[PDB]
Scaffold this motif. Structure first.
Motif, short mmCIF file in Angstrom:
data_model
loop_
_atom_site.label_atom_id
_atom_site.label_comp_id
_atom_site.label_asym_id
_atom_site.label_seq_id
_atom_site.Cartn_x
_atom_site.Cartn_y
_atom_site.Cartn_z
N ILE A 66 -46.20 7.69 -43.23
CA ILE A 66 -45.87 6.93 -44.43
C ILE A 66 -47.07 6.86 -45.39
O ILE A 66 -46.95 7.20 -46.56
N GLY A 67 -48.21 6.42 -44.87
CA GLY A 67 -49.42 6.22 -45.68
C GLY A 67 -49.47 4.84 -46.32
O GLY A 67 -48.59 4.01 -46.10
N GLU A 97 -50.09 4.58 -49.79
CA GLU A 97 -49.83 4.81 -51.21
C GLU A 97 -48.54 4.12 -51.65
O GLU A 97 -47.57 4.10 -50.89
N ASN A 98 -48.56 3.57 -52.86
CA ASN A 98 -47.44 2.84 -53.50
C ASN A 98 -46.17 2.60 -52.65
O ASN A 98 -45.34 3.49 -52.49
N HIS A 99 -46.05 1.36 -52.16
CA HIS A 99 -44.96 0.91 -51.26
C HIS A 99 -45.17 1.27 -49.79
O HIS A 99 -44.42 0.80 -48.93
N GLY A 100 -46.18 2.09 -49.51
CA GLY A 100 -46.50 2.53 -48.15
C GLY A 100 -46.65 1.41 -47.13
O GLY A 100 -46.02 1.45 -46.07
N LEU A 101 -47.47 0.42 -47.45
CA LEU A 101 -47.69 -0.73 -46.56
C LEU A 101 -46.40 -1.49 -46.27
O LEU A 101 -46.12 -1.84 -45.13
N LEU A 127 -43.30 -0.28 -46.49
CA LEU A 127 -42.44 0.58 -45.68
C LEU A 127 -42.87 0.60 -44.21
O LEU A 127 -42.03 0.49 -43.31
#
Ligand SMILES: [Fe+3]
Ligand SMILES: [Fe+3]
Ligand SMILES: [Fe+3]
Ligand SMILES: [Fe+3]
Ligand SMILES: [Fe+3]
Ligand SMILES: [Fe+3]
Ligand SMILES: [Fe+3]
Ligand SMILES: [Fe+3]
Ligand SMILES: [Fe+3]
Ligand SMILES: [Fe+3]
Ligand SMILES: [Fe+3]
Ligand SMILES: [Fe+3]
Ligand SMILES: [Fe+3]
Ligand SMILES: [Fe+3]
Ligand SMILES: [Fe+3]
Lengths: 172, 172, 172, 172, 172, 172
Positions: free
Chosen positions: E150-151, E153-157, E159
């Motif tokens: 996932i990572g 990056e933008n919305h990653g956390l 998700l």
């Protein structure tokens, strides 16, 4: 003691035995694709492809049963090692869809030969297989469509894998 | 993206992959033996060996699942064409029992290596497989003992095949 | 007719046959201890030791079944007459606990030899026996602890026997 | 503390203790016969004789319970090593039937002594044992009659073993 | 009064007591990691890690029960104050996965010593713990794989945390 | 990203975190007391104190949950090694009762501070804890009263341990 001759024609015997070997080869290909996914954090696709591999082997078994009941010797050849080199999820499903198209074509050819040979026992038998293969081909088309719609940019792989995981779970 | 390294040691990975391929080879051998029986009026043995073949493939699948869960790439080799010519029921079961002895030895070797390597996750995992293989080896010993007790004279083959048919049905 | 050779190694055969005889000897020892208790007004301990005697024979039977399934001849030796001279309840349980320690050691030795010989069929089989023997050894430790905590002074024997009676009833 | 004297007469005590030891000896004999059958491909007879062996031990236990309840010390002797070498199925069952005849006679002797001694508690207690032993003696007569009717020629041993297997399973 | 000596060897006693303390150190570490997540808007990981912490303490208690039953004194050391400062979600799970690998190694070492010492009571007891630890280690590998896929990056956390939340809830 | 500030005052945060650590210390103390009892033939008290230890940790967890929900960092300190040496059953329960009195005082202090601060969320939350601690304090008073009523002489220790065993089982 005397056992009865094979109940199927030589051409149909050849085609069906080739199909058994095709399905075994296919099951191993899907196991290889599955393993690639599992080792690259794509457990959704991993599960889907594993369960699909198992299903292709179930097809091989059903074909074997039909050969057995017709007193037709099952002729198992060497099962070639599957490809294992894959670039990514999209490539795997592109290859898989092309592979399913080839399987569909092979079944169409057997059914066509059954009609030409007036072997309606075999034609009738293969109907579950025609129907199930059609479902599988459509399924791979749909998954490929979805993977290409999502893409691989910002969380794309995760989204695609979760989509495929959903399908895997719904089918088992 | 980064995926975690295989969770098993190199030696264990190799032995387990080799075992998957052993079981696939075994399954195809039993399909071939089964077919011989079905084409020589021995449908009891045919059924038994078919169902046994399917079970060996089930073992292969369980091994694959374990490899997948440990992030271990599954390496499928070319599955050799099985022997297809056989002398009779007794020879088939003599060969099968010797084969089961070989499979038991192969599992013993993996478990032993797991102990030596201190890989107790793998040791613990393999216990169902040790138990099931022992049951299968004993089963083939018992069937071979029975075939030899009956013999091939008079209605011997019929009696032996019916005996094996009964076992096949009871295990379903 | 030809019957298949024993499936276990000579060393393992010897150890397992010795164990069958050990359990039979043990069952008779416990019957003797039980009888002492019953004839000295200790029916709680009498019942407990009788039921334990019966359980040790159940272990012998399970070992016999394993030998049978492996085509291993069961070699029953003379079962020595058990000791019958006892000083009291405490001495009986002291002797019994020491005896259970010896049984545990004997099982540990078989399992160790199974590992050394790579006989994982036998290792796997013996696991119920390892677990059950551990429970029995702990049980005898606990009863001995309780008898020594109570002692034999003012109603001590009665209290101890009733305690043991409670355990006997809860286990059946 | 004072415990009550044995409630049975000296002669009855001795005969009953001797009977416990007879049944223990019998159980080990049948285990040995059972093992011979299992190691000579006769698993039907093997199972039957194993289960019979276990039943004779159950009789020993019931006799022990009666001794215990009457405050009679149980005197367990050394249980002799059973015969282990046998000629075949017929000889085993010939020996077994003769053995059952001996056991029946031994019980008749105890019951007779109970009548002469006016020990009607013991006479009454032994009635289940008289009844069960009669059933067992008749059973061995029937199996021996069947083995002799079938014979050892052709598939005779197989047929006889399967017959005995059926009885073994029906009595479970 | 006299109480029976510890039933385990000095070496096994030391290793098991060390393991109890290791699990209690672990439990506190996971509570601290959980708190970090809860105070940084990651309630999914917060819940998962809290429930995991509780489970590690459950393991400590099961080890304590085993020590108690063997009359082995439980030797609780000071439990060190856990790390409380963390960089983020990925770092926490990287540290956790490394930690679980260490726990797995520690259990492997105890099991290995049990084999070397012929302590098969302890070997047999530890099998649930080997199996459960393997599942936990695989779980942390899987979660780390997903967090990395996932990572951040933008919305990653978000998700990743929602993914972990789903796992936490499914395991309840 | 921004996470909301802790929802509790600094003084209440301090008192609650101290309480978490107090309960963890208490659990380890009770595990140590339990082990002493188990290794000195007092399995009644052993079980009671083990289950009590577990319950104190349950309190710690419930406090942690409350801190988490209020966005308050959990601050786990070094848990000091518990006393491991004890004089006997009476001494253990005397020490335990005094300890419970201290825990009760500590809770009274937090509730008092919640009232003074006007923190009625915390006051309301703590009510289950006040009620449960009261029950636990009364329980230890009752057990101590019973131990002192029975005494240490003439089976006293056995009678007391059995009394405590009954309580332990009834609370399960
Ligand atoms: Fe397909
Ligand atoms: Fe297909
Ligand atoms: Fe998105
Ligand atoms: Fe097998
Ligand atoms: Fe196998
Ligand atoms: Fe025992
Ligand atoms: Fe035992
Ligand atoms: Fe008293
Ligand atoms: Fe009899
Ligand atoms: Fe009898
Ligand atoms: Fe016939
Ligand atoms: Fe863990
Ligand atoms: Fe753990
Ligand atoms: Fe408390
Ligand atoms: Fe408390």
């Amino acid at each position: 003691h005397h056992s009865q001759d094979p109940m199927l024609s030589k051409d149909i015997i050849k085609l069906l035995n080739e199909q058994v070997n095709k399905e075994m080869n296919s099951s191993n290909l899907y196991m290889s694709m599955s393993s690639w996914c599992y080792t690259h954090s794509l457990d959704g696709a991993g599960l889907f492809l594993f369960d699909h591999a198992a299903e292709e082997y179930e097809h091989a078994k059903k074909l074997i049963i039909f050969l057995n009941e017709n007193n037709v010797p099952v002729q198992l050849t060497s099962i070639s090692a599957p490809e294992h080199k894959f670039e990514g999820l999209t490539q795997i499903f592109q290859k898989a869809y092309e592979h399913e198209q080839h399987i569909s074509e092979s079944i169409n050819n057997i059914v066509d030969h059954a009609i030409k040979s007036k072997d309606h026992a075999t034609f009738n038998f293969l109907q579950w297989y025609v129907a199930e293969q059609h479902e599988e081909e459509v399924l791979f088309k749909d998954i490929l469509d979805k993977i290409e719609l999502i893409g691989n940019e910002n969380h794309g792989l995760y989204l695609a894998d979760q989509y495929v995981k959903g399908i895997a779970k719904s089918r088992k």
